[PDB]
Amino acid sequence: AQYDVADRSAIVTGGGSGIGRAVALTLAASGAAVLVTDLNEEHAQAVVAEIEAAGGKAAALAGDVTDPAFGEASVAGANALAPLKIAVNNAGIGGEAATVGDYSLDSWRTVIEVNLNAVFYGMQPQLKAMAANGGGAIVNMASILGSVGFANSSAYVTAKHALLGLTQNAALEYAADKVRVVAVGPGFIRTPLVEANLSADALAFLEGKHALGRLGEPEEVASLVAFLASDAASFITGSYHLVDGGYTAQ
Amino acid sequence: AQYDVADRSAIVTGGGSGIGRAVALTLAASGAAVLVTDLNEEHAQAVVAEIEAAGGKAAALAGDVTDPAFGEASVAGANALAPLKIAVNNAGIGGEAATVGDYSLDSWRTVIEVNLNAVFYGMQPQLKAMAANGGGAIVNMASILGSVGFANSSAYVTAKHALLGLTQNAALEYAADKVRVVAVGPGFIRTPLVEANLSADALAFLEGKHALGRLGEPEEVASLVAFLASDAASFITGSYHLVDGGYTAQ
């Protein structure tokens, strides 16, 4: 079931694996020219390879979203493929597993730098670009933890909470330039990253806290992002959109 | 009338003026020992002077909440007056007035640093301290802009959004130590600063956006903080509490 998203380029920050990868492939298959951005070049390229192999169009750009210069570069790169109309700010990281009191300052600043500032840095030329060439859609990977909290993952939830405000505000200011901005809110998704660190017993626990009694799969998050990034979602801006098997309904 | 808040000390960061000042005096009058923290010594001291003069106990501490060392210092200071319960993290700042796109990197990092990180830095020894001496209550000055957005004040709303998550999460992990953590959400408050820097036509606009058809007064915010910081509010932790003349109900 394809999404309108054609004739456009899309930046998929942290697109080398998991959700970002799913998002990259899903957009790509619906005609989108995807710039797969990632810290790991080998991962970013493997995805581009998958896209191309399945008929699609795509280029890789390995770097650090924390560096504002990398944001303008991703824009100019994607923009070289086709007019930039989508941007999925997916790149995030878990911080130290500890209480607010015990939390290292480095870890806290780091998690915020990646999960929140990088988004902002990236969003800046994204917004100017889409505003120039007629409109578009920025999708920010928030989380369930943008509206609820989770013991020992302070920095994560704080940053994910901050996206919602950044999203809202960007949506207000660039609505009149027909640039939409939305925030997706996944629950716990089984990505190889989440699966690699976190036990069998641990994941069982988190499963039980979702109404569906399982974790989400990356494609399940990718569908909603693909939709929201498309012309099909042309009256949706500023809003936060859960995909959490009824995690927050409790 | 009075709030339970006696026997103990309270930190009121940014307590030299406006809301913080109102909060300082209100707690002080109900028996609380208040540590009035501010960037200005002359302002912080004027308040201490007012408290002492009206029968109360208070000490001043001028510094920068950005500096984590200043957080431990405020704790040990307040704690010298009386065991520490109550902490009102009020200190914040407005950033540059511009779009997300045009926003300077300095300004954005600054407002985040003050409006979000400083709170976190401060909260850390606040939490360990109250957790040691039996329990207490941290009140974080969020805003209406922690749940809605406001054109050109991107960084502000993003940071105010982040407090809600920081609040929620701290509340979860130190609930069992009987340390409550809540977030207050004022609407536009008529402080002497706000009146000077804002036009007749501008104020008309902001007033009209509140259901009560006026801006709040600092004491109106101070009442709810005083209450939440008291033993009277002993089943309130993790929650966000609006005082906005029905700004967000629209």
Side-chain angles (χ1 to χ4, degrees):
Chain A
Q2 70 186 114
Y3 311 81
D4 209 359
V5 307
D7 301 11
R8 321 165 149 214
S9 54
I11 299 154
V12 182
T13 284
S17 186
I19 296 175
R21 177 271 192 78
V23 173
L25 304 192
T26 303
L27 292 173
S30 305
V34 183
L35 195 88
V36 184
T37 265
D38 206 80
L39 197 70
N40 186 347
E41 176 138 290
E42 188 179 37
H43 285 200
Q45 246 157 41
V47 172
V48 173
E50 285 175 330
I51 292 172
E52 285 190 10
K57 176 164 176 190
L61 198 62
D64 201 338
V65 279
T66 59
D67 188 4
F70 192 66
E72 335 191 340
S74 295
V75 166
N79 206 293
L81 299 162
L84 182 66
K85 266 125 182 161
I86 298 174
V88 193
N89 297 305
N90 168 74
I93 199 52
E96 179 174 330
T99 58
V100 172
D102 287 335
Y103 219 97
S104 86
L105 198 154
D106 282 337
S107 186
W108 174 273
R109 165 223 172 280
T110 303
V111 170
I112 297 278
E113 256 285 343
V114 182
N115 294 18
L116 189 254
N117 301 282
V119 180
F120 160 69
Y121 303 146
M123 210 177 296
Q124 287 185 320
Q126 284 170 11
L127 285 160
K128 293 215 185 96
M130 293 187 198
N133 60 24
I138 299 160
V139 180
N140 294 332
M141 282 306 307
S143 176
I144 53 161
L145 307 184
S147 49
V148 304
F150 198 98
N152 291 165
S153 311
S154 336
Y156 192 89
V157 337
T158 307
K160 292 318 194 192
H161 265 73
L163 293 173
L164 269 63
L166 177 47
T167 307
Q168 271 175 18
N169 228 100
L172 290 185
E173 300 156 38
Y174 293 92
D177 291 310
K178 289 157 166 65
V179 180
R180 310 184 292 91
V181 179
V182 162
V184 175
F188 293 127
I189 312 304
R190 267 172 197 263
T191 62
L193 199 55
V194 172
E195 294 197 314
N197 53 105
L198 277 188
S199 167
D201 280 355
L203 294 183
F205 180 92
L206 291 179
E207 282 179 348
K209 188 73 158 139
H210 302 78
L212 300 172
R214 70 167 173 78
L215 274 77
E217 294 298 334
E219 323 86 38
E220 291 172 314
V221 175
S223 318
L224 171 59
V225 178
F227 176 83
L228 291 166
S230 77
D231 310 80
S234 72
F235 202 59
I236 309 176
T237 190
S239 42
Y240 169 66
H241 288 275
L242 293 152
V243 39
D244 65 349
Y247 189 96
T248 38
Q250 298 182 50
Chain B
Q2 339 209 252
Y3 311 96
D4 208 297
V5 308
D7 111 74
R8 71 263 296 169
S9 55
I11 296 155
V12 183
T13 58
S17 178
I19 297 174
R21 184 184 166 286
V23 173
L25 302 187
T26 302
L27 270 60
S30 304
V34 43
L35 194 89
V36 184
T37 266
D38 205 79
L39 195 70
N40 193 341
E41 83 94 15
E42 282 207 322
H43 289 162
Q45 244 299 320
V47 174
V48 156
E50 285 176 324
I51 293 173
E52 285 187 346
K57 179 178 310 203
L61 199 58
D64 194 354
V65 279
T66 309
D67 191 357
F70 195 63
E72 277 82 16
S74 296
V75 165
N79 203 137
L81 300 163
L84 180 77
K85 276 116 193 316
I86 319 185
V88 193
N89 297 307
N90 169 73
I93 197 35
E96 178 175 331
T99 57
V100 172
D102 287 334
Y103 220 98
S104 86
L105 311 106
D106 277 353
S107 186
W108 204 83
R109 296 161 187 282
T110 303
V111 336
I112 297 277
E113 183 65 13
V114 182
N115 294 16
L116 177 64
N117 299 280
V119 178
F120 161 68
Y121 303 146
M123 277 190 66
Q124 286 187 319
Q126 285 170 11
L127 287 159
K128 292 184 285 188
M130 293 188 199
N133 60 25
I138 298 160
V139 179
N140 293 332
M141 283 307 307
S143 176
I144 53 163
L145 307 186
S147 47
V148 304
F150 198 102
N152 290 22
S153 310
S154 342
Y156 196 94
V157 335
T158 307
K160 290 318 208 325
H161 265 73
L163 293 172
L164 269 66
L166 178 45
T167 306
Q168 272 171 8
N169 222 90
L172 266 75
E173 53 222 57
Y174 291 90
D177 291 310
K178 290 203 205 74
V179 180
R180 309 182 293 91
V181 180
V182 306
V184 174
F188 293 130
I189 309 305
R190 189 177 202 97
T191 229
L193 200 57
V194 172
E195 317 184 314
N197 147 106
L198 186 160
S199 328
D201 277 3
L203 170 59
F205 181 90
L206 288 317
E207 285 180 355
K209 291 281 152 223
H210 302 79
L212 299 172
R214 70 167 172 82
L215 276 74
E217 294 296 335
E219 320 88 40
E220 287 171 309
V221 175
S223 319
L224 170 59
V225 178
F227 176 84
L228 292 167
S230 78
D231 309 315
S234 72
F235 201 59
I236 308 178
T237 189
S239 43
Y240 169 66
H241 288 275
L242 293 152
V243 39
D244 65 349
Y247 189 96
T248 39
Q250 225 152 52

